[PDB]
């Protein structure tokens, strides 16, 4: 608006969601578990069966279903995931990050390096305030998979 007496410049939380969702699947997977490994248990209070199905997949099938979630592909796992309340998506991703971190689950390929563009968003996210990171992470993972109900 021409009302630029020095007023707002945007949402930043919205900007990050946008620049996030403009990323490749692997970048998005990468950025997600960096930002979930670090958030730790602070996203939801300090689902459980979808995790088992993934936890017990061959690492390439885990890749398959992670890419499916980020690409909103209408697979069994995207519908099981999409059917979860958005605050369960929070607890799911937390535990997913712990399985990824402990080595039971493999997001991104075995040769993956975050790109300059991926490292860009990751840094924009990291420097948001605590509550803003929670919003960005809640929203970007709530549009993941597919809602059969919706």
Sequence spans of domains, the chain? 13-142
Final resolution, Å: 3.1
Nearest to 85 by CA among 145, 16, 5: 145
Distance CA 13, CA 91 (A): 21
Determine contact, residues 39/93, Cβ cutoff 8 Å.
Answer: no
CA distances from 6 to 2, 11, 16, 90, 113 (A): 10, 15, 22, 36, 39
Burial of 104 (0-12, 13-18, 19+ CB in 10 A): middle
Reply yes or no on domain 13-142 having CATH 3.10.20.600. Answer: no
Rounded distance between C-alpha atoms, residue 112 and residue 110, angstroms = 6
Name the residue among 87, 89, 138, 109 with its Cα closest to residue 29. Answer: 109
* Residue 23 in tokens: 């990323």
Angle between helices 48-55 and 86-101 (to 10 degrees): 30
**Phi and psi, residue 119, nearest 5°:** -65, -25
Q: What is the largest CA-CA distance in the chain?
A: 57
Closest CA to 100 of 68, 72, 60, 62: 62
């Amino acid at each position: 608006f021409s009302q630029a007496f020095g007023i707002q410049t945007g949402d930043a939380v919205a900007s990050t969601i946008t620049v996030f969702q403009a990323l490749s699947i692997d970048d998005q997977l990468a950025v997600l578990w960096y930002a979930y490994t670090e958030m730790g248990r602070s996203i939801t209070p300090a689902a459980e069966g979808l995790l088992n199905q993934i936890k017990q997949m061959s690492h390439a099938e885990q890749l398959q279903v992670m890419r499916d979630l980020a690409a909103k592909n209408n697979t069994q796992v995207s519908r099981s995931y999409g059917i979860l309340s958005n605050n369960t998506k929070l607890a799911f991703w937390y535990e997913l990050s712990e399985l990824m971190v402990k080595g039971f689950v493999v997001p991104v390929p075995t040769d993956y390096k975050i790109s300059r563009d991926g490292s860009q968003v990751l840094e924009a996210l990291k420097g948001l305030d605590f509550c803003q990171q929670i919003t960005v992470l809640r929203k970007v993972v709530a549009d993941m998979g597919v809602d059969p109900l919706a």
